[PDB]
Each structure stands twice: as structure tokens, then as C-alpha cells.
Homo-oligomer: A and B are copies of this chain.
Amino acid sequence: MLGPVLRLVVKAGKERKLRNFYPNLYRDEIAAPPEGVGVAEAVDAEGHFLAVGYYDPRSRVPFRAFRFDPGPLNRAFFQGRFARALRRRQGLGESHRLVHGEADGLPGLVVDRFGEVLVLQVRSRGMEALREVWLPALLEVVAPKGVYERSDVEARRQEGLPERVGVVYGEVPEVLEVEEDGLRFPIPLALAQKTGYYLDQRENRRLFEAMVRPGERVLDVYSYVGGFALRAARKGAYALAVDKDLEALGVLDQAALRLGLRVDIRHGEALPTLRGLEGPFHHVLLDPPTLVKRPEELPAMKRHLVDLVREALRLLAEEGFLWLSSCSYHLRLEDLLEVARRAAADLGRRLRVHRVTYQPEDHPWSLHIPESLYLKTLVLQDDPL
């Protein structure tokens, strides 16, 4: 009744990654491709089962494993995946990531939860092709009031997929009211499409708020909608938020107005802005985009980070705290440490490593997917003898 099962044969000796729960197979690791595009079973050289997933040569990864046990990629399968995801996020409040792609056994799907509204992103050909199957499953398990789709245009384009933005189900407000620990950020959907909201900094934002003392001065660089700055203000500190996105600063402005809190705002670029500040500030926070495409780009990126951190440290009060985050898998903690050491040497400052943090639980770091870890943060305190 059906066409023959699509079956992929993995090169001998390259099946170990799949057996060890790494979901991606590239072209050179496939001994024999399936006789078409779609849901496929992967087997080893001796024909033993390895995975069921999606085969499509047009995808950046030709085979992405969806499951590591036999079975279909049907409605019930997706129901179980979303049920697992939901359970993993129990007690994580109302604003959190629900689905973090392959780490949640759902390659190419990101789902963020803001109260009763979901915002999702589809990043791979397999997940796009299975949309008619998994979406009803998602709606059934979560039962949201509405679902919005945003697009990583370049990610879609690299997968040969069209951009896709809009309400996919139910009702989504024109202004998404993102709530985090009593703070409400009114984010217009246009901004939600372009950027979104950085749920991955939630635990850093909580740690930061507990450290702020009334009367202190805070510099929140790459602030976006000002999660850090607003918390500083709530604690009685003076905060200056810096971002090049005027739309994002507009949200921070409104969010601060709602609470009768005063936050200073600078619309401008991080490095030029910091070069024009005198300081000092008791906390300086840096959350730069650190786009690294190739490893050879790393020394140049680290030199730029040194320029930024040198200004940040110059602006740092005695015994103050400097927060340096990187959201690239290619930029390791060791690289951040090197950057900090170079900047400190330029200024003759002595620093202590106060905390090192990694992305929170709703953005799972899988042991088996080395690139699962992308966000890490180095918190330094000025430590004079």
C-alpha cells in the first residue's frame, strides 16, 4: 500500500555518534542514502537499527535523527515529545523556553512560552515538512491561547525554506506582555519577530538583581528591552541602558514608566558609547552578539572583545562587578578568560572570578551534542589587594 520504507545506511565506524544520541549525519558519513526524501530509518553497516529521522539533501544536515528507537514520526510521537518537554519545564514559571530543538528530541523546532502565548521557530526542512503532524500535537498538549511564528530568515534560507511570520493559531496580542519575576515588558510583535525575548538570561538576571544595592550605578550594555537595567532600578540603583535598537529601548522606557522607575537610556553603539563615558559604575554588564562562523575568525573576535572589555573595566568602580556573556558555541569560557586577562593587563587591574554560569535548564545542554552549549557568562569582581 505504501512506498518502500526509506532506509539510510551509515558508513562503518560512523554509526557510533548516532548510537550515542548525536542526531546529525552529514553526507560523508552516509554509505547509502534513502531512495527519496522524507521520513527515513537509519541503520548501521550490518543493518542494525540506529534511528528514525528526516532525510533531505537540501537540508544543512542531510539526515537529522528525530528518535533513537523504532517507530513513526506520527501525531502520538510528537504528543509524547511535547508532553516530555512540558514536564521538564514544571516549576519554571510562566515565561520559559518549552522546546529547545535537538536537545529536546525535536530537531529544528524552537518553542518559547509567554504565559498562554507560544512563539515558535521552525529551522529545518524535516520539521517544516512535518508541520501538519506536530502542530496539532503541540496545541493538544499545551492548549495555548495563541501561537505566533517568527523566522530566523538566514536559517530558513540556508534550508531553502521561505520566511514565515504570523499567528499560527488562536489569539496573539499586538503587544506581547512578557512577564518575568514581576516585571512586565510590552513587546510589539514587529520587535518580537526581528529579535524576540532572551529567556536564556533569566537566571543571570535573577543573580544580578540579588547583588544590586540601592544607590549603586549600573551600566547595562547590549540591554535589549532592559531586563538587567530594570531590575537594577527596582532595587534602587541608577541604571544606564545602552542598545542600538531604538525599538527595544522604547519597550524598556514603557516598562520603566509602568513601575515608576527611572532608567537612563542611551541609543547608540556599545564601543563608541563606552569610549565616551567616564564612569565609574558598580556593575557593568556586557551581552554582545558574538557571531562566529569559522574558527579562524576567533582571534579577530577576541581582539574586538578586548576593546570592549578594556572600556568596561576602565568604567568599573573599585570592587565592582563586570559581567561578560558570549552566546556562541565557538567562543568558550577559556576565550572569555583570555580576553579578560588581556584587558586587565592593559589597565593594571586585579580581578577575581566571581561566578561562571551557563544557560538555564529550559535551554538544555545535552552531554551528547557538544554544540548544545552556546551561552556562558563570566562574572568578575574587581579584587584589589
Instruction: List, in ascending order, chain B residues with CB within 8 A of A345's CB.
Output: 16, 19-20
A105 contacts chain B at the CB level, 8 A cutoff: yes
A281 contacts chain B at the CB level, 8 A cutoff: no
Instruction: List, in ascending order, chain B residues with CB within 8 A of A67's CB.
Output: 385
- In terms of DSSP, what is the predominant structure of the interface of chain A? mixed
Instruction: List, in ascending order, chain B residues with CB within 8 A of A16's CB.
Output: 345
A365 CB contact (under 8 Å) in B353, B364, B385:
B353
Q: Is the CB of B353 within 8 A of A373?
A: yes
A367 contacts chain B at the CB level, 8 A cutoff: yes
A366 CB contact (under 8 Å) in B105, B353, B365, B373:
B353
Q: Which of A3-11, A137-145, A252-260, A354-362 contacts B (4 or more CB under 8 A)?
A: A354-362
Tell me the residues in window 232-260 of chain A with beta carbons closer than 8 Å to chain B beta carbons. Answer: none
Q: Using CB atoms, name the residue of chain B closest to A353.
A: B365
Tell me the residues in window 338-374 of chain A with beta carbons closer than 8 Å to chain B beta carbons. Answer: 340-341, 344-345, 348, 350-356, 358, 361, 364-368, 373
Instruction: List, in ascending order, chain B residues with CB within 8 A of A224's CB.
Output: none
Instruction: List, in ascending order, chain B residues with CB within 8 A of A353's CB.
Output: 358, 365-367, 373
A84 contacts chain B at the CB level, 8 A cutoff: yes
A291 contacts chain B at the CB level, 8 A cutoff: no
Q: Is the CB of A105 within 8 A of B385?
A: yes
A68 contacts chain B at the CB level, 8 A cutoff: yes
Instruction: List, in ascending order, chain B residues with CB within 8 A of A366's CB.
Output: 350-353, 383
A21 contacts chain B at the CB level, 8 A cutoff: yes
A337 contacts chain B at the CB level, 8 A cutoff: yes
Instruction: List, in ascending order, chain B residues with CB within 8 A of A337's CB.
Output: 367
Instruction: List, in ascending order, chain B residues with CB within 8 A of A147's CB.
Output: none
Q: Is the CB of A380 within 8 A of B367?
A: yes
A19 CB contact (under 8 Å) in B348, B351, B367:
B348
Q: How far apart are the CA atoms of A348 and B18 in the complex, in Å?
A: 11
Instruction: List, in ascending order, chain B residues with CB within 8 A of A356's CB.
Output: 356, 358
Q: Using CB atoms, name the residue of chain B closest to A340.
A: B367
Q: Using CB atoms, name the residue of chain B closest to A365.
A: B353
Q: How far apart are the CA atoms of A218 and B200 in the complex, in Å?
A: 31
Q: Using CB atoms, name the residue of chain B closest to A337.
A: B367
* Interface membership of chain A positions 1-37, coded 1 if the CB is closer than 8 angstroms to chain B and 0 otherwise: 0000000000000001001110000000000000000
Measured between C-beta atoms, what is the minimum distance from A206 to chain B in Å?
15
A-B contact pairs, 11 of them (CB 8 A): A19-B345, A67-B385, A81-B385, A84-B385, A341-B368, A350-B367, A350-B368, A352-B366, A353-B365, A353-B367, A353-B373
Please list the 10 inter-chain residue pairs (A to B) with the smallest Cβ-Cβ separation, ordered nearest first: A353-B365, A105-B385, A351-B367, A21-B350, A20-B345, A352-B364, A353-B367, A352-B366, A356-B358, A340-B367
Residues of A within 8 A of B (CB): 16, 19-21, 67-68, 81, 84, 103, 105, 337, 340-341, 344-345, 348, 350-356, 358, 361, 364-368, 373, 380, 383, 385
